[PDB]
Every structure is written in C-alpha cells, then in structure tokens.
C-alpha cells in the first residue's frame, strides 16, 4: 500500500497518461544491484547483467558497442545521460533505466509505447525519489 511493490505496480505499471497503454514490466533495484521490487512480468535477469548495468553507470558508453543484455535479450544502447540514464532499443520495444542516489528504476516497453513515454514514466519516479533524498 505504501510498499516498494506498490511503487512499481501503481507508479511504473499504471496506464500511461490515459492512453490505454502500459509498460510491459518494471523494477526498482538498489545501486548495489539487489532488487527492491519488480513486476510479475519483469524478465529473469542474471546477476552479471545487473553488474554490467552498474558498470555502465560508472563508465558511461562501455556497453554501446556490444549491447545491453537482460534475461539473455539484447537491447541496442541508444543515447542516454552519463551516470544517470541508460536507454536501449530492441525492435519496436525498449528499456530505460534511471539511476538516483540510492536506486536504479527500470522500465521495459513494447509497441505501441514510445521510448519517450517509458523515459517519462521512469524519470518522473526517479526524480521523485531524488527529492525524497534517495
């Protein structure tokens, strides 16, 4: 009801701006890579996939040549913001990951959702957490 799981279910996985569309899945992780909550649909990620993401936030652009993997699926890395946002694309779907002071906020989308909407959902939550000192 006020839990991390509620944050994911009600603030990441909500109907996007009344359009009738949703993210396919979402999660909130610590910057250390432990999951705080995820959606029932969030992919079966592996520990080294999460470490590579943590590395990409420390060494911007490391993944650009070879890709971002999550549950064995490859996303092509597109323009993000060093140490703060990682974006990726896979077909007409994608992924967006926003790092805060303490957390990383993941969003995964599939057509017809646009990358801008995923970015907007994940960044709105990420920015709120930063305001609460997280």
């Amino acid at each position: 009801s006020g839990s991390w799981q509620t944050y994911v279910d009600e603030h990441l996985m909500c109907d996007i701006e009344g359009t009738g569309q949703h993210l396919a899945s979402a999660a909130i992780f610590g910057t250390d890579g432990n999951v705080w909550a995820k959606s029932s649909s969030f992919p079966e990620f592996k520990p080294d996939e999460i470490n590579a993401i943590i590395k990409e936030f420390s060494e911007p652009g490391a993944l650009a040549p070879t890709g971002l993997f999550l549950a064995g699926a490859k996303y092509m890395v597109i323009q993000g913001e060093p140490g703060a946002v990682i974006r990726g694309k896979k077909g007409a779907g994608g992924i967006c990951i926003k790092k805060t002071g303490q957390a990383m906020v993941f969003g995964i989308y599939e057509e017809p959702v646009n990358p801008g909407q995923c970015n907007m959902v994940v960044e709105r939550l990420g920015d709120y957490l930063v305001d609460q000192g997280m």
Binding site: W4, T6, Y7, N34, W36, Q102, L129, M134
Partner: peptide, 9 residues
C-alpha cells in the same frame, strides 16, 4: 532497502 517514502500523486 530503505523504507519507502510516501507515494506521490
């Protein structure tokens, strides 16, 4: 994890 802060609007 830290405790969730109050959820936003």
């Amino acid at each position: 994890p830290p405790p969730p802060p109050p959820p936003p609007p």
